[PDB]
Design a protein around this ligand. Structure first.
Ligand SMILES: O=C(CCC(=O)N1CCC[C@H]1C(=O)O)[C@@H]1CCCN1
Ligand SMILES: [Yb+3]
Ligand SMILES: [Yb+3]
Ligand SMILES: [Yb+3]
Ligand SMILES: [Yb+3]
Ligand SMILES: [Yb+3]
Ligand SMILES: [Zn+2]
Length: 608
C-alpha cells in the first residue's frame, strides 16, 4: 500500500512511463552531469504538482513545454534524501502525460556510485565507475519516483572519455564521437521492457568483451576476460533451463559484467547486463549458482517485482527457488537438496547472528525508518526459500509447484505485487488443495521472527560425508590428530569441502592444535576458491590462530563482497590479537571502499 522508503508521489498520484537520460561522466570531478527527461502520466484529476526522490543531487533547472518551472527541495530526511516538489505549469487530467526535463549533477559522495582511480583497477592506466541502485540509490543518480511500485522504459546517451566504454542495463544501440567534444564518445542504450528504477545501472571503464553464447557477452577489464569466459560458460544452458521453468526470456541479450573486487554483492540482476563479483573466478565453475540466481531474476524480480521493499522476500525467495531448480536440472535432484539444506544452515547462522526475536528475521519486514542497506540479509533468501520448499513438499512435489511458479510469473509479469497478492494467487491456483494450505501457520511464516515453525525434509545423500568428517574433527582429541590425512578429502567435491567447513565453523572455536593439524594435512591456505577460503579463515580467526591474521586482513581488504568483508572484519575485531589492526585497516581503507560497504563495516566495528 505505502512505500515508506520513498518521499516521491506515489503511483496512485502519478506514474513515470519513460526516462530519456543524457549524461556525461566527469572523472576529474567525480560527477555525472546531465538531463533526465521523465514522461509522467497523471493518475488523478487536476494534478498540479508532484514530488520526486533525490539524494545529494544538485538541480540546475526543471523545464516543461520549453519553459523553466518552479521547484523546491525539502530538507534531507537522512538516508531517504530530499524530496523535490515540482510545480506543473498546467493542471493535468487523469491519464494525461507530460515530459519533465530535469538538469542535475551528482555528488562525488553519491551512495549509488563508486569511483575508482587507475591504481584501483586491473590495468592501472584508466579510472572506472560503477553504479548500484538497489534498493533506494537510484535517487542518488537522478531525480525519480524511487520506488519499485513504478515501472518505466528508458533510453540513454552517455558521454565518456573516448578511451573508455560505457554499458548500461539496456540493449546497446551504437557509439559515435561526441559532436560537442572530440576527446569523448557517446554510447547509446535502449531498454524497451518496463523496469523499476532500481534496475538502472551504469559502468564506465576500459572494458573488453568476449562472446560465450548466442545471447551472451562477458565484459571485464582485459586481464579478467579469459578467466571469466571460462568461469561462466554454463550461462546459455542455464538460460535455456530458466526459460523452460519461467517461460520466455523477454530481455533480448543476457550479458555478464565482471566488476572490480570492491563490488558489494555476488551479483546484481541488472536487465541485459548482470553484474558479478570477481570473487566468482574460482577456476572450476563451482560458484556458478550465482549466475543461476542472476538469470532467475529475469523472471522473479525483474518481471514480477516487489511493490515495496517490505516484500523483498518475493524477489529473493522465488529466485533462490528457481536457482536451485536450475542447479538441480544440471547436476541432479540430490544436489538440489544438498544446496537447499545448506541454505537452511545459512538461515540458522543469520538468525543466531541477529537474535531469534530481531524484527529483521521476519520474512515480511516493516522498513519504516530503516535504511534498507542496514536491514539487508540472507533471511528473505533462505526463509523465503524454506517457505516455498515447504509448500512444494506439502502440495505434491516439485513438478506441481513448478507449474504454480510458471503461472505466477505469467499472472504478474510487468507488475509490482505484495505478499497478499502472492498468497491470494497461491490459494487461487491450489483451489483444490485449500484444506492443505490452511494447515500452514501463515502468521508465523510471514510475520514472526526467528526460525520457521517447521523445517522442510531434505535428502542427506551428499551431505552425510561432510557431516561425518566435521564430526571426526569436532570429537577428535589430541591423540586422534595423527589419523587425519589428505586422503580424507579425495572423494569430496569443492561444494562438499565448503560444506565440511560450514559445519565445522558452526562449532567454532576448535582447539588451536586441531586447526594447525588441518592446515598440515589439507593445506587449506592454498585454496583460492573464495567461499572455501572465507570459511577457513573465519574458522582460523575464531580459533585464535595468530598466523591467520594477515591472511584474513588481506582477504577482507583486497576484495569487498560484503558477504566476505563484513564477517571477516567482525571476526578480526573480536580477536584481541587482531582488534587494533582490524580497526586501523578499516580506517586506512575506508575512503577508497564502496560507500555502502564502508558505512556498514563502520557500523559493525562501531567506528565513526
Ligand atoms: O539478489 C541479489 C544477489 C545475491 C547476493 O549478492 N547475495 C546473497 C547474500 C549475499 C550476496 C552475495 O552472495 O554476495 C542482489 C542483491 C541486491 C538485489 N539482488
Ligand atoms: Yb493529494
Ligand atoms: Yb478536471
Ligand atoms: Yb533560467
Ligand atoms: Yb483469496
Ligand atoms: Yb584418546
Ligand atoms: Zn537475488
Amino acid at each position: 500500500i505505502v512505500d515508506t522508503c520513498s518521499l516521491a508521489s506515489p503511483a496512485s498520484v502519478c506514474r513515470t512511463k519513460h526516462l530519456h537520460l543524457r549524461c556525461s561522466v566527469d572523472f576529474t570531478r567525480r560527477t555525472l552531469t546531465g538531463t533526465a527527461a521523465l514522461t509522467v502520466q497523471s493518475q488523478e484529476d487536476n494534478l498540479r504538482s508532484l514530488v520526486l526522490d533525490t539524494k545529494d543531487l544538485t538541480i540546475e533547472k526543471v523545464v516543461i513545454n520549453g519553459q523553466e518551472v518552479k521547484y523546491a527541495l525539502g530538507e534531507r530526511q537522512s538516508y531517504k534524501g530530499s524530496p523535490m516538489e515540482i510545480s506543473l505549469p498546467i493542471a493535468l487530467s487523469k491519464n494525461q502525460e507530460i515530459v519533465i526535463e530535469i538538469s542535475f549533477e551528482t555528488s562525488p559522495k553519491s551512495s549509488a556510485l563508486q569511483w575508482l582511480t587507475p591504481e584501483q583497477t586491473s590495468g592501472k592506466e584508466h579510472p572506472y565507475l560503477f553504479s548500484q541502485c538497489q534498493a533506494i540509490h537510484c535517487r542518488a543518480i537522478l531525480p525519480c519516483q524511487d520506488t519499485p511500485s513504478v515501472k518505466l522504459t528508458y533510453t540513454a546517451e552517455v558521454s565518456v572519455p573516448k578511451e573508455l566504454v560505457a554499458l548500461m542495463s539496456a540493449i546497446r544501440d551504437g557509439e559515435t564521437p561526441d559532436p560537442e567534444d572530440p576527446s569523448r564518445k557517446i554510447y547509446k542504450f535502449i531498454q524497451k521492457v518496463p523496469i523499476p528504477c532500481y534496475l538502472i545501472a551504469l559502468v564506465v571503464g576500459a572494458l573488453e568483451s568476449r562472446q560465450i553464447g548466442p545471447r551472451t557477452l562477458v565484459w571485464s577489464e582485459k586481464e579478467q576476460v579469459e578467466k571469466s569466459a571460462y568461469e561462466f560458460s554454463e550461462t546459455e544452458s542455464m538460460l535455456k533451463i530458466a526459460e523452460d521453468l519461467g517461460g520466455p526470456y523477454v530481455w533480448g541479450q543476457y550479458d555478464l559484467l565482471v566488476l572490480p573486487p570492491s563490488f558489494p554483492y555476488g551479483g546484481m540482476e541488472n536487465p541485459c547486463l548482470t553484474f558479478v563479483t570477481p570473487t566468482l573466478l574460482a577456476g572450476d565453475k563451482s560458484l556458478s549458482n550465482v549466475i543461476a540466481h542472476e538469470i532467475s531474476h529475469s523472471w522473479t524480480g525483474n518481471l514480477v517485482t516487489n511493490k515495496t521493499w517490505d516484500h523483498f522476500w518475493l524477489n529473493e525467495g522465488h529466485t533462490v527457488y528457481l536457482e536451485r531448480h536450475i542447479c538441480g536440472r544440471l547436476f541432479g535432484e540430490k544436489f538440489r537438496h544438498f544446496n537447499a539444506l545448506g541454505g537452511w544452515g545459512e538461515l540458522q547462522n543469520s538468525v543466531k547472528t541477529f537474535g531469534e526475536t530481531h524484527p529483521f528475521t521476519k520474512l515480511v519486514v516493516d522498513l519504516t525508518d530503516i535504511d534498507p542497506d542496514v536491514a539487508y540479509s540472507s533471511v528473505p533468501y533462505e526463509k523465503g526459500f524454506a517457505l516455498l520448499f515447504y509448500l512444494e513438499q506439502l502440495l505434491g512435489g516439485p513438478e506441481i509447484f513448478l507449474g504454480f511458479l510458471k503461472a505466477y510469473v505469467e499472472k504478474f509479469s510487468y507488475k509490482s505485487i505484495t505478499t497478499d497478492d502472492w498468497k491470494d494467487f497461491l490459494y487461487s491456483y491450489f483451489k483444490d488443495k485449500v484444506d492443505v494450505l490452511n494447515q500452514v501457520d501463515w502468521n508465523a511464516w510471514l510475520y514472526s521472527p526467528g526460525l520457521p515453525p517447521i523445517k522442510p525434509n531434505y535428502d542427506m545423500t551428499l551431505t552425510n560425508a561432510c557431516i561425518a568428517l566435521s564430526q571426526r574433527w569436532i570429537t577428535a582429541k589430541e591423540d586422534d590428530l595423527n589419523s587425519f590425512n589428505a586422503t580424507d578429502l579425495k572423494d569430496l567435491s569443492s561444494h562438499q569441502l565448503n560444506e565440511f567447513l560450514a559445519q565445522t565453523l558452526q562449532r567454532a572455536p576448535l582447539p588451536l592444535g586441531h586447526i594447525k593439524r588441518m592446515q598440515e594435512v589439507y593445506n587449506f591456505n592454498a585454496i583460492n576458491n573464495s567461499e572455501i577460503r572465507f570459511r577457513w579463515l573465519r574458522l582460523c580467526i575464531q580459533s585464535k590462530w595468530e598466523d591467520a591474521i594477515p591472511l584474513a586482513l588481506k582477504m577482507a581488504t583486497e576484495q569487498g563482497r560484503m558477504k566476505f568483508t563484513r564477517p571477516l572484519f567482525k571476526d578480526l575485531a573480536a580477536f584481541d590479537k587482531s582488534h587494533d589492526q582490524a580497526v586501523r585497516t578499516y580506517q586506512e581503507h575506508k575512503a577508497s571502499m564502496h560507500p555502502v560497504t564502508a558505512m556498514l563495516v563502520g557500523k559493525d566495528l562501531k567506528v565513526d
